[PDB]
Amino acid sequence: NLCPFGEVFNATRFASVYAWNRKRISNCVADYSVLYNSASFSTFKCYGVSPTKLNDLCFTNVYADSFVIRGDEVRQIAPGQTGNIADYNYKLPDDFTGCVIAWNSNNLDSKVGGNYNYLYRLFRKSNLKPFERDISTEIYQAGSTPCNGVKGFNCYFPLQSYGFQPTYGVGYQPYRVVVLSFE
């Protein structure tokens, strides 16, 4: 009756950072030393919980969120930081209690001659709220003059592509991220 963690971590293809997926786990047996004692996870750090103490803690609900971001950008995944992701893409409330995982997936996502399947927002009027996401692709407004759906001046399409490539520097190499939130 073990939890489906495997299909989340051994999944085929991940979503984009601005359109991250969300899954609910409840009424299940979850083991973590199998996840904890793995050399795969280049980065693995938790908050408010001892990583060894998970087996002693029960919860009503567990939420798993995943996406794909650039390598030298994982630092933005922490409660109380700034940056494009932490501003317009994914927010972490400071009262966070859960683990954050990230490992290099260069051999799974990057492709020769650019991979143009992953996006991220660049413009938005106001910052996000904790555990909140948006998908709308309305043309951004940057001045008092309204343009009404034309990408002329001061009206920019708010989505750009990462364009991963398997020969880039390790800073730009892609990274998969899994975020756990608790009761």
Epitope: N106, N107, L108, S110, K111, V112, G113, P166, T167
Partner: antibody, heavy 120, light 108 residues
């Protein structure tokens, strides 16, 4: 990633359509590109393009006129190279090269012994 | 497109004595390269890659060298099974992946 096999071709008339067939063996990686390289008579090697069999992309080097690289099937695990009506210039020998992610061990299985295409 | 010039065109060497190879690039290919070997009548065989690390199942006499826009390959023990044609190939800046020209190593 193991042995690849190609189908020994022979002469054709002035330009028609042909199909060149590489193969697979197994234990393949998730990222899976396979490329095609050609060698003039006693000259250096020239690249053509690569294809990722799952969600085929078929990115071409800028010589793509008689160069239609399509796997077109996983049924017999092949990476067919196709063109129509090429006449005199492309009398050569074409190798298929394997590859993977994590840019090591890409060019290891580099075809076996390959197809002396005769055009005229 | 970057031209991968190779010098010298031919390299007449004696058996046993160490022999060296040189490949030239137009601009930064800083750490992506390879070195092939094509005995006449069969398909080229990868020897090294990343400009320094050797491949698997190859003799320890081969050794990469160089970086940036200048490279070098060195052979220490010319046996009876090393005279072939050697090509250098980049694998960055995709659209024109390019080879070199070759150096017909021979005897005397």
């Amino acid at each position: 990633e193991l042995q690849l096999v190609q189908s020994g071709a022979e002469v054709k008339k002035p330009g028609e359509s042909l199909k060149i067939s590489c193969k697979y063996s197994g234990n393949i990686s998730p990222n899976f590109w396979i490329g095609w390289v050609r060698q003039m008579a006693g000259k250096g090697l020239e690249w053509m393009g690569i294809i990722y069999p799952d969600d085929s992309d078929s990115r071409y080097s800028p010589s793509f006129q008689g160069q239609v690289i399509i796997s077109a099937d996983k049924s017999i695990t092949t990476a067919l190279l196709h063109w129509s009506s090429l006449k005199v210039s492309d009398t050569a020998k074409y190798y298929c090269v394997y590859g993977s992610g994590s840019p090591s061990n890409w060019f290891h299985p580099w075809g076996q012994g390959t197809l002396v295409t005769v055009s005229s | 497109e970057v031209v991968m010039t190779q010098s010298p065109a031919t390299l007449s060497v004696s058996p046993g004595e160490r022999a060296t190879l040189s490949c030239r690039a137009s601009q930064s290919v800083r750490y992506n390269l390879a070195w092939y070997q094509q005995k006449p009548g069969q398909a080229p065989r990868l020897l090294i890659y990343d400009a320094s690390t050797r491949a698997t199942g190859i003799p320890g006499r081969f050794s990469g060298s160089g970086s940036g826009t200048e490279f070098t390959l060195t052979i220490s023990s010319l046996q009876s099974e090393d005279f072939a044609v050697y090509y250098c190939q980049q694998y960055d800046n995709w659209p024109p992946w390019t080879f070199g020209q070759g150096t017909k190593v021979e005897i005397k």
